[PDB]
Amino acid sequence: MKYLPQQDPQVFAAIEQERKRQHAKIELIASENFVSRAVMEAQGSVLTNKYAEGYPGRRYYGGCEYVDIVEELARERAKQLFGAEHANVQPHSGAQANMAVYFTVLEHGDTVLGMNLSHGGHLTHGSPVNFSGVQYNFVAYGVDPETHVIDYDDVREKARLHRPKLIVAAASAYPRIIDFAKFREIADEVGAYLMVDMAHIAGLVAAGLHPNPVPYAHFVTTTTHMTLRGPRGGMILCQEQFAKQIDKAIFPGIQGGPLMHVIAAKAVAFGEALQDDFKAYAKRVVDNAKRLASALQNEGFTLVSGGTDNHLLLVDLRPQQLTGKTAEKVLDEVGITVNKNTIPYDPESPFVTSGIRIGTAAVTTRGFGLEEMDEIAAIIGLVLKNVGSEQALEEARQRVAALTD
Amino acid sequence: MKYLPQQDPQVFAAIEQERKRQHAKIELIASENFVSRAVMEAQGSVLTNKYAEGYPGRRYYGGCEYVDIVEELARERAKQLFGAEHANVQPHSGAQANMAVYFTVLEHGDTVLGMNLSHGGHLTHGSPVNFSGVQYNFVAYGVDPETHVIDYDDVREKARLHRPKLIVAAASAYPRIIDFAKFREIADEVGAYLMVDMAHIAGLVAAGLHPNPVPYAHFVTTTTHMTLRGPRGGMILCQEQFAKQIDKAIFPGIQGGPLMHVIAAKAVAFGEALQDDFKAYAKRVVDNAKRLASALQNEGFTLVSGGTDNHLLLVDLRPQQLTGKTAEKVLDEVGITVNKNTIPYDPESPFVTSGIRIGTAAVTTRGFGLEEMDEIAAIIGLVLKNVGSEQALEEARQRVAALTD
C-alpha cells in the first residue's frame, strides 16, 4: 500500500495486523478462503466510482459502457462455470442473493420448506430472528438421527404436509453431497419451486466435485467468497424464464446501485475458477478434508455423518465431554481457528453446542497438503484431549507455528 | 495494478477504460464522486478475507480482533462526524441501510409517509416496484407547485390524515435545505418515528453546510459514497435506545457477514471527512453548485426551485421544449454526464421527464472551480439551445476537452 499508511496509520496498522494474523493462524472456518491479488486489485479499483443501477445495456445512467463490459464478463464467466441460463452478479452478499429470490417467488406469509437450522440449514433459511423466518412461514426437514444424512423421506412428507410454495436445499454445515435431483422431484410432486443455496459448495460445483444444482433448480443462490474463492458478495443463477423477474427483484426490488468494483472482482474470481489449476485446487480441498476427517477419527474423534463428501466436517465432541464453545476457545488459544456449531439433535443450545465446524478451503489455498492435515489433526487431538494441560497447549502452539512458518 | 493486467487482460482493459472515461468526461451525476487512493487501497485489502458476523467484541467467529479495530474506528469516526449516539457501519448500501430501519420499526403493511417520488423522493421511499412500497403502505407529501419547496403544511395534513408509523424525510433530487426540526415536530404530533435519509447530503452535513438531521431523527440513514465521498456502501445512525434493535436488524436481520474491507474504506473516508480540507472541499461543492445554477439561469435555463441550497440542481427543460431524456443524450454526445430526472408536477412520464439532474461533487473533487462552472454552463447552453447543430456539438466537445485536459 502507498497512500493508506500515510493518510491513515490507525486503519493501516489494523489492516497490517489482520494480514499477519491470516498468515500466522491455522484458518479452519469452513466458509473462509484467501482471494488472489488480482481479485483484490479489482475491488480496490476506481469502479468503486460509478453508479450503474440497471443492467448492461439497460442502465439508468450514462457512461456505463465500460462497467457493462465488466458485468457481462462476470455474467458470462458465471454462465460458463455453472451452465445456468441467466446470472445476476449484483447481489451484495449471499443474504441479498437469497432475499431477492424470496422477494421474487414469495408473498409475505407463504410457506417455505428448508433444512433444519440445527442440522445444517443456514440463518437465511428460516431463522425466526432472520428476515426469512420473519417474513415467511418456514418449515424444516431434518437429517437421520444416526447417519446424519438428510432424510429425503422426511423432506417429502414435510413438503406434502405443509405444501410450501418454495423448497430450499443446501446448507452452511452439511458435510455430505446433497441430492438435487431428489429435491426437485419432491418440489414437482407438490408444485413448489426449488431453490438451491450452494454458497458453501460453489467452488466444488465449479470444479465438478459436487453435483451441480443448476439443472435441477429454478433458482440457485451462492456467495462468491467461500469455496469459489471470490470477493465477498452474492450471485443468483436461474432459468431464462425467471431472468427478468430476478433482475427486477435485485433492482429496483431490493438493492440500489451495484458494487461495480466487486462485480469486477467477481469476474476475476470467475476467470480463475475457469482455469485448470482452480480445478486442481478444489480437488485438494476435498482430498484434504477427507484426510483431515480420517486423521481426526484416528485421534478418537466422532464426526457427524462419519466423515465428509466435501470441504467441511463437523466434530461431535460429546465423547470428549466438551462444549463446541469450549473446544473453539482452547483451539483459539493455540492458533487454530474453528467455529462452534450445533450438531444434529444437539442437547446444547446454539450458543454452546456439542460440535466444532471445520473446513479445508483456506489452508488448501495456502498450500497445505495431506501431511499438514495429519499434523493439524494430531494437534487438535493433543489439545482437545488434554484441555487442562498447559504443556499440551504450549506444544500445540509450537506445532502450529511450525506449520504456519 | 500488478497482478490484474497479467491474470485478466479483459477485465483490466475495461477497468483501464473506465478510469480514462472518468478522467475524460464531465461528471455531473449528482450522486457521484471520486474516492481517494487510500479509500481504494482499504477496499482492495485482505480484509475482504474475514467472516465477521456480529459486532466488535461480540462476534460469532474467532480471529476478529483486528477487523473489530477497523469497525470501531469507522463507528467512532462516524460518531465524531455526525454526533450520533450509535452507528452501524455494516449496511452494504443505502438501500440496505433503509431496509434495516424499515425492518426494525415497521410491521408489514404499516403506513409510512415519504416524499413524493416525482418531487425528489427516492426509490427506497415507497416506489411500488421497490421493497419499500411492496412491503409497506407509503403515502407522500409534495413540494409547492410554484416554489418547488417541500410543503410542510402538506406533510402535516398527510401525517394527520394517514397516521403513519414512520415519516421519512430526504431525497435524491431536492435542491433545497430540508427542515428536520419541522419534520420531527410533525412526527411527534402524530406519534410517528422520524427517519432521515441523508444519503445525498451527508458530506454537506459532515462539513456543517447542511443542518444535521441527527438531533431530530430517531434514525438517520445514508450512503457512504455521495457527498461524503466514501466507498460504495451504507450506514445507519441512531439514538442509543434503538442501537440494539438496529444492530439486530442488520444482523441477524437482513444481512450476513459484513464487508470488512469496505468497512475499512468507510473508516478511511470518515477520517478524511474529519479533516479541515474536506470541509474546504464541501464548501467548494456548494459554492460551485450555486455558481453553476446562476450561470445556467444566465444562459436562459429555468431551475426547479429557482436555484440550489446544496450540491445539486434540477433544470426544467420545458422552456427549451426538451424531454430530460433528449437533453441527457445530447449532453452525453459531447462528454457531459447528467441524469434525466422528473421535475415536480412533470407532464412527462418518469422514463422521459422534463428535467436533468446535475450535481457538482465530482467535478469539485477533481479541482473545478467557479470559472469551470461558468464554462460548463456555457457549454450546456450552446448544446441544449442548438440541438440540431452539429457545429455547436463539435464546439462543445472541444470545450469539454479543454476542461478535462
The Cα A121–Cα A143 span in angstroms is 11
Closest chain B residue to the Cα of A40, Cα to Cα: B44
At how many Å resolution was this determined?
2.1
Torsions phi, psi for A337 (to 5 deg): -95, 120
Residues A51 and A197 in one domain: yes
Q: A243 and A205 in one domain?
A: yes
> Residue B197: helix, strand or coil by DSSP?
strand
- Residue whose C-alpha cell is 464453545: A325
Instruction: Tell me: do A213 and A167 sit in the same domain.
Output: yes
Co-location of A88 and A174 in the same domain: yes
Q: Which domain holds residue B312?
A: 1-32+284-405
Q: Which residue of A has its CA nearest to B73?
A: A11
Cell of residue A228, nine digits = 469459489
Residue for grid cell 447552453: B381
Tell me the nearest-neighbour CA distance from B297 into chain A, angstroms. 24
Residues 6+ apart with CB under 8 A from A173: A30, A120, A312, A314, A341, A342, A357
Burial of B358 (0-12, 13-18, 19+ CB in 10 A): buried
Nearest-by-CA chain B residue for A36: B3
Q: Closest to B63 (Cβ–Cβ): which among A21, A123, A248?
A: A21
Q: Would you call B5 exposed, middle or buried from its count of C-beta atoms within 10 A (0-12, 13-18, 19+)?
A: middle
At A130, give phi and psi (nearest 5°): -110, 155
Dihedral angle sign, alpha carbons of residues A15, A17, A23, A27: negative
> Which of B324, B397, B399 shows the shortest CA–CA distance to B357?
B324
Is residue B358 a contact partner of residue B32, using CB atoms and an 8 Å limit?
A: no
Which CATH number fits the domain that encloses residue B187? 3.40.640.10
Name every chain A residue with its beta carbon within 8 A of the beta carbon of B23.
Answer: none
**CA dist., res. B316 & res. B322, Å (int):** 9
The residue to which cell 441550497 is assigned: B309
Half-sphere exposure of A345 (CA within 13 A, CB side): 13
Contact A56, A33 (CB under 8 A): no
For residue B190, the distance in angstroms to the closest alpha carbon of chain A comes to 27
Residue of A nearest to B272 (CA): A7
Number of domains present in the structure of chain A: 2
CATH number at residue A336: 3.90.1150.10
* Record: contact B18-A70, CB cut-off 8 A: yes
Q: Is residue B95 marked as binding?
A: yes
Determine whether the interchain pair B40/A46 forms a contact, defined as Cβ–Cβ distance below 8 Å: yes
Contact criterion met (CB < 8 Å) for B38 and A73:
no
Domain end (from B234, B266, B283): B283
Q: Is residue A282 within 8 Å of A251, Cβ to Cβ?
A: no
Half-sphere exposure of B379 (CA within 13 A, CB side): 28
Domain finish residue from A236, A254, A283: A283
Distance from CA of B128 to the nearest CA of A (A): 9
Q: Is-contact B134 B160, C-beta < 8 A?
A: no
Residue written as grid cell 410432486: A189
B186 vs B192: CA distance, rounded Å: 8
Report chain B residues whose CB lies below 8 A from the CB of A8.
Answer: 38, 42, 267-268, 271
Terminus-to-terminus CA distance in chain A, angstroms? 23
Q: CA B279, CA B207: separation in Å to the nearest integer?
A: 5
DSSP state of B210: S
Same domain, A243 and A343: no
Asked which of B238, B254, B283 is the last residue of a domain, the reply is B283
Whether A298 and A342 share a structural domain: yes
Say if residues A230 and A39 touch (Cβ distance below 8 Å).
Answer: yes
Q: How many residues does chain A have?
A: 405
- What is the SS3 assignment for chain B? CCHHHHHCHHHHHHHHHHHHHHHHCEECCCCCCCCCHHHHHHHCCHHHHCCCCEECCEECCCCCHHHHHHHHHHHHHHHHHHCCCEEECCCCCHHHHHHHHHHHHCCCCCEEEEECCCCCCCCCCCCCCCHHHHHCEEEEECECCCCCCECHHHHHHHHHHHCCCEEEECCCCCCCCCCHHHHHHHHHHHCCEEEEECHHHHHHHHCCCCCCCCCCCCEEEEECCCCCCCCCCEEEEECHHHHHHHHHHHHHHHCCCCCHHHHHHHHHHHHHHHCHHHHHHHHHHHHHHHHHHHHHHHCCCEEHHHCCCCCEEEEECHHHCCCHHHHHHHHHHCCEECEECCCCCCCCCCCCCCEEEEECHHHHHCCCCHHHHHHHHHHHHHHHCCCCCHHHHHHHHHHHHHHHC
- Residue B356 near residue B340 (C-beta atoms within 8 A): yes
Which DSSP letter does residue B356 get? E
Tell me if A22 and B49 make a contact (CB, 8 A cut-off).
yes
Nearest Cα residue in chain B from A49: B34
Cβ–Cβ pairs < 8 A, chains A and B: 277
Q: Which residues in chain B have Cβ-Cβ distances shorter than 8 Å to A2?
A: 37, 41
Q: Compare CB distances from A8 to B15, B131, B268 and report the shortest one's residue.
A: B268
> Do A321 and A384 form a contact (C-beta atoms < 8 A)?
no
Q: Which residues of A are annotated as a binding site?
A: 51, 93-95, 117, 121-123, 172, 200, 225, 240, 257, 349-351
